[PDB]
Design an enzyme around this catalytic site. Structure first.
Site, PDB file in Angstrom:
ATOM      1  N   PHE A  74       0.497  -1.014  -0.093  1.00  0.00           N
ATOM      2  CA  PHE A  74       0.240  -0.318   0.020  1.00  0.00           C
ATOM      3  C   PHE A  74       0.806   1.078   0.069  1.00  0.00           C
ATOM      4  CE2 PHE A  74      -4.047  -0.236   0.162  1.00  0.00           C
ATOM      5  CZ  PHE A  74      -5.080  -1.575   0.364  1.00  0.00           C
ATOM      6  N   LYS A 168      -4.988 -10.503  -6.864  1.00  0.00           N
ATOM      7  CA  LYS A 168      -5.550 -10.910  -7.120  1.00  0.00           C
ATOM      8  C   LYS A 168      -4.822 -12.047  -7.028  1.00  0.00           C
ATOM      9  CE  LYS A 168      -8.803 -14.523  -6.335  1.00  0.00           C
ATOM     10  NZ  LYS A 168      -7.419 -15.558  -5.835  1.00  0.00           N
TER      11      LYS A 168
HETATM   12  C1  LIG Z   1      -8.467  -4.452  -3.131  1.00  0.00           C
HETATM   13  C2  LIG Z   1      -8.134  -3.818  -1.621  1.00  0.00           C
HETATM   14  C3  LIG Z   1      -8.577  -3.620  -0.978  1.00  0.00           C
HETATM   15  C4  LIG Z   1      -6.777  -4.276  -1.261  1.00  0.00           C
HETATM   16  C5  LIG Z   1      -5.953  -5.416  -1.662  1.00  0.00           C
HETATM   17  C6  LIG Z   1      -4.855  -5.637  -1.248  1.00  0.00           C
HETATM   18  C7  LIG Z   1      -3.570  -4.797  -1.472  1.00  0.00           C
HETATM   19  C8  LIG Z   1      -2.519  -4.094  -0.127  1.00  0.00           C
HETATM   20  C9  LIG Z   1      -2.765  -5.620  -2.009  1.00  0.00           C
HETATM   21  C10 LIG Z   1      -1.800  -5.584  -2.752  1.00  0.00           C
HETATM   22  C11 LIG Z   1      -1.787  -4.725  -4.386  1.00  0.00           C
HETATM   23  C12 LIG Z   1      -2.716  -3.916  -3.678  1.00  0.00           C
HETATM   24  C13 LIG Z   1      -1.525  -3.150  -3.432  1.00  0.00           C
HETATM   25  C14 LIG Z   1      -3.630  -3.561  -3.901  1.00  0.00           C
HETATM   26  C15 LIG Z   1      -4.445  -2.392  -4.370  1.00  0.00           C
HETATM   27  S1  LIG Z   1      -5.669  -1.878  -5.159  1.00  0.00           S
HETATM   28  P1  LIG Z   1      -5.612   0.038  -5.808  1.00  0.00           P
HETATM   29  O1  LIG Z   1      -4.690   1.249  -6.142  1.00  0.00           O
HETATM   30  O2  LIG Z   1      -6.451   0.599  -6.315  1.00  0.00           O
HETATM   31  O3  LIG Z   1      -5.574   0.437  -3.864  1.00  0.00           O
HETATM   32  P2  LIG Z   1      -6.760   2.084  -3.993  1.00  0.00           P
HETATM   33  O4  LIG Z   1      -7.788   2.080  -4.355  1.00  0.00           O
HETATM   34  O5  LIG Z   1      -5.281   2.752  -4.219  1.00  0.00           O
HETATM   35  O6  LIG Z   1      -6.153   2.010  -2.095  1.00  0.00           O
END
Ligand SMILES: CC(C)=CCC/C(C)=C/CC/C(C)=C/CSP(=O)(O)OP(=O)(O)O
Ligand SMILES: CC(C)=CCC/C(C)=C/CC/C(C)=C/CSP(=O)(O)OP(=O)(O)O
Ligand SMILES: CC(C)=CCC/C(C)=C/CC/C(C)=C/CSP(=O)(O)OP(=O)(O)O
Ligand SMILES: CC(C)=CCC/C(C)=C/CC/C(C)=C/CSP(=O)(O)OP(=O)(O)O
Ligand SMILES: [Mg+2]
Ligand SMILES: [Mg+2]
Ligand SMILES: [Mg+2]
Ligand SMILES: [Mg+2]
Ligand SMILES: [Mg+2]
Ligand SMILES: [Mg+2]
Ligand SMILES: [Mg+2]
Ligand SMILES: [Mg+2]
Ligand SMILES: [Mg+2]
Ligand SMILES: [Mg+2]
Ligand SMILES: [Mg+2]
Ligand SMILES: [Mg+2]
Lengths: 304, 304, 305, 305
Positions: A74, A168
């Site tokens: 994040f 995913k």
């Molecule tokens: C989907 C979710 C709530 C969490 C995924 C959990 C995480 C950190 C997965 C790692 C891959 C990442 C950073 C996805 C963020 S999607 P994005 O860039 O659209 O996220 P944002 O909208 O910037 O919070």
């Protein structure tokens, strides 16, 4: 903003408060935050809370690794919004050999030694399961700065791409690591279609709730790193409606994917193909979906 | 039909004569051929020869398993052309639990006991590697009767579908089984992009050489099973040229995928990432591409 | 990039030097170039030279009109890249009543009076034929800012869109104007298929050579006007190859459209529908294809971005 | 399939029973149906009923013209399903000179003389308004056999094509004819965005209810004429859901276009741009959308395949 009903019920890891203090504390100590307002915003997001909603059945002595990994992804996800595609790609590629353990970190650069120390600590805890998270992380990192983000996409091509950009596959491997849940390749092949459906739900739920944040970023940050690439605007364009209208339609599509998940899992079980491991896994996916949505609904990251 | 030059040199398994005799002889004994002409057409195709060109480094005691599996798949591939999508699907679905060993064959039906006995013997030989071939085969079986074949497709959508319909994944797992070549999930993830590129080459080389056959089938066989779905048609339609012209263009695209294969492998090696198992595997893919082409150029299946 | 063999032979209009010097001189006097570098680059493009390759059998007193029109359209083509689709559309719509002669130019704005004076002169020379170019041009102009550039397209849909964006129909009406070649409504219907094929060749040969230029642009101009919309990128992503690989494949496809041109022509001739008017036109279409390619291969517009 | 809530109130022309009897009667006398089963199916579809729901404020002495025209277009729409693109194109093109009144019909061929007599009677009643329906009808007819039906389309590209294939523009001209509603070119240009929005609703509502019919056709009729080309399949493919799930999602998007219609109309009026004729016009579009949906929900044409 009013979500349509869902039959999925979220669950949170029992140790969420103590692990979130531990992991928030580690990043507040080591990460280069620019100022106190940014430190407060970091805590307000609750990154360990979303991790604990994603993986509520994580083993007690593994959940903190997942909190650390999602927290640092994040933080990087937000840094890339101020970079060009080229800069962002150079930034991520530096970290990939370091994640493997093949290149030592520059210890004066927090992101390098945080990444190095974390993956070393996960390999020390469970080498084989830790190693299975690497290429999925790298696939996600490379999608983040893919110039395909600046090219026109339809809804289908976007969901295909977003599967990688939403992480995913790394989330599935990390869930397995966190639970000590080992699955054979044949078992994983059996739930491929369930995985793909789940990815769309995670993607679009995130797009809906994070749209106002992303819209603001697109107007204020780097025109490449900050580019608006989301199902909300792709559907609004295709249908010629507002973003608000597109979110209402996308929400209804999310509940259709939840129904499809239930159908696919019921079929797996009826065909006698749902092993004990697979049963735990698909239930695990259902927690990711409902947990992501509950956090998305409530985190200050998206509402301020 | 002038093939552009290639740097790939094909190789054939040393036991091709012996194994062909054995496997051809087995099906001539058990398979229900409708008449003598079909028995001759079967032998004339050379299905064990294409298997030996595909997996020239298979272990001497495993190559016959591969010949039997690809032979029975080809035979079914041809029967499906005279069925509806619904009839083909019911046919294939009956064989899937039998392949798993979950359901005993009706021994009065040759395809049922040939399938059952073959998989039972493969699992007896190498349980874990045999099990890794099952879901790839089923993925391919289900593609064969997918109604997407009857709907418009562009080159990109088609290649994504053809990857299943051509059996890329089962060929990969079958190659590994046949060589005794075990690869970790992490190693397999490293070569995902190399696998996808190779798939396009196999798909389109086949489309090119098998076009006259499939055209003829579309004019005489079943309306669904016989439907023409191929890159030759798709490109001719998108570019508004003839099938002949489309083949010449597709052939150049095939040599581009060959160059890309070499580039991707060189990068894998330049990074520290080509393990000895991976080196054997990507070499094996190159044999598949060159071997398929050599067979396709010479087999009577395609010239008459 | 090594081109594959071709049977088409390019021809250049006899008066290329004289007309180039004349028309370049006119734009260097009247066009609002921002600086000396831009004036030098304009000259390096050779826009009158590509016109003379496109229409090598234009009448000697008509060729300068075609150089002027294609020059000013190239110049506007480049400006539109730095505009939104809305700004771009507003810019073009302003020029349309002016091109018609229905509205006077603001003489303090060079594009308006250059366009105004140009069309006036053309109608003054041949009213009937000059008028036939107008809707083709407006077609092309409206295509340039069509939001469909910002929508995903496969290769087939792209080629139908590109026909308008590459100005196939205005090049036809201009070719005819410049040669005094009149054709009946019946003759023009017979070649609709030969036209559509020729459009593909012009479109993609340009796509191949102009790719590096358009790529740079897509990175540095306006998120809408500068958007990359090209067969090189569409094929690269459909086939998963590099832009360079897609160029080599597209080039082979270009040669097949050439063969197909020959086939459709003989087919029109074998049926005997080949009028003397129709015969000059399809030989003229072949000059467009081969001339476009020669220019593209050599112009500094494409080699020095 | 439960439709989501709508604020639109459908209205039906008060002469629907009398005109349905008259016009069905006419086609049962003149059209060549293949058997009694097809005659009964024809009457069951209620084609004058959808006309009366589409144009409930049509003038009492004009509504029968609209019923005749939409009826014969539905009949032809179904015949084209058994033809190739080339065959259907030849079929439609033969009717275009006859529609114009330029070529006499073969009086032994019902589609020819029904079309001839109908357009003659419309011009006899109101020449200027009848003539304004011609090019919109031809645009629709040529969309019906367009090759683009056999090329992959995403949702945006499809809706752009489907505006022609659904006959949006002919329905607007026919509405105006039937109401004697005259609009200036300026007034027409003003509502282009409202038109485009309404087109998506008509298109998708039709796709939703007619999907089972069209699926069956695509399995049993000509491989080109019968080809499945519909938003239901496009969304199901793009989102990876069942056709039924796609219908539920698309229905929610139809209500978004209803909301957007209301917003555009408000804005037209909030700016100073809404005339008395425009007000009647955009209210008429609302009846088209609600009327088409009400008919589609209840006609045996879609529920008994
Ligand atoms: C989907 C979710 C709530 C969490 C995924 C959990 C995480 C950190 C997965 C790692 C891959 C990442 C950073 C996805 C963020 S999607 P994005 O860039 O659209 O996220 P944002 O909208 O910037 O919070
Ligand atoms: C690609 C190739 C030559 C062989 C693949 C080797 C085999 C047996 C793969 C198993 C799956 C099958 C039968 C694919 C045939 S593709 P198809 O239906 O187009 O093959 P056809 O043209 O019918 O020979
Ligand atoms: C097609 C060709 C080489 C010449 C046609 C000659 C001209 C000027 C035709 C008028 C229409 C235009 C400006 C086409 C350029 S396509 P573009 O915007 O792709 O051209 P660019 O690559 O910017 O040079
Ligand atoms: C949209 C609607 C209910 C009516 C439009 C009224 C009519 C007849 C308009 C003329 C243009 C046509 C025939 C459209 C049918 S769309 P289609 O071919 O999809 O219609 P189908 O589904 O076959 O009933
Ligand atoms: Mg983000
Ligand atoms: Mg992100
Ligand atoms: Mg987001
Ligand atoms: Mg086959
Ligand atoms: Mg096959
Ligand atoms: Mg084949
Ligand atoms: Mg340009
Ligand atoms: Mg341009
Ligand atoms: Mg160009
Ligand atoms: Mg229709
Ligand atoms: Mg229809
Ligand atoms: Mg319909």
């Amino acid at each position: 903003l009013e979500p349509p009903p869902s039959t999925f019920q979220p669950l949170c890891h029992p140790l969420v408060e103590e692990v979130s203090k531990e992991v928030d504390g580690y990043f507040l100590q080591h990460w280069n935050f620019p100022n106190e307002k940014a430190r407060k915003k970091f805590v307000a997001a609750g990154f360990s809370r979303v991790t604990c909603l994603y993986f509520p059945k994580a083993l007690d002595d593994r959940i903190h690794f997942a909190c650390r990994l999602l927290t640092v992804l994040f933080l990087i996800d937000d840094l890339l919004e101020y970079m060009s595609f080229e800069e962002g790609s150079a930034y991520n590629e530096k970290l990939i050999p370091i994640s493997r353990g093949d290149v030592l970190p520059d210890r004066s650069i927090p992101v390098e030694y945080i990444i190095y120390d974390l993956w070393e600590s996960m390999r020390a805890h469970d080498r084989e399961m830790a190693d299975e998270i690497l290429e999925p992380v790298f696939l996600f990192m490379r999608a983040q700065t893919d110039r395909t983000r600046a090219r026109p996409m339809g809804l289908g091509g976007y969901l295909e791409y977003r599967e990688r950009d939403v992480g995913k596959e790394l989330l599935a491997a990390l869930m397995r690591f966190s639970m000590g849940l080992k699955l054979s390749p044949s078992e994983l092949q059996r739930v491929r279609e369930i995985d793909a459906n789940c990815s769309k739900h995670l993607s679009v739920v995130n797009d809906i709730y994070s749209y106002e944040k992303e819209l603001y970023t697109s107007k204020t940050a780097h025109s490449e790193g900050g580019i608006l690439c989301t199902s909300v605007q792709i559907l609004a364009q295709e249908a010629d409606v507002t973003a608000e209208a597109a979110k209402r339609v996308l929400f209804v599509m999310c509940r259709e994917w939840e129904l499809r998940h239930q159908l696919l899992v019921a079929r797996l079980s009826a065909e006698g193909l749902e092993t004990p491991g697979l049963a735990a896994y698909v239930e695990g996916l259902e927690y990711q979906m409902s947990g992501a949505e509950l956090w998305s609904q409530t985190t200050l990251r998206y509402s301020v």
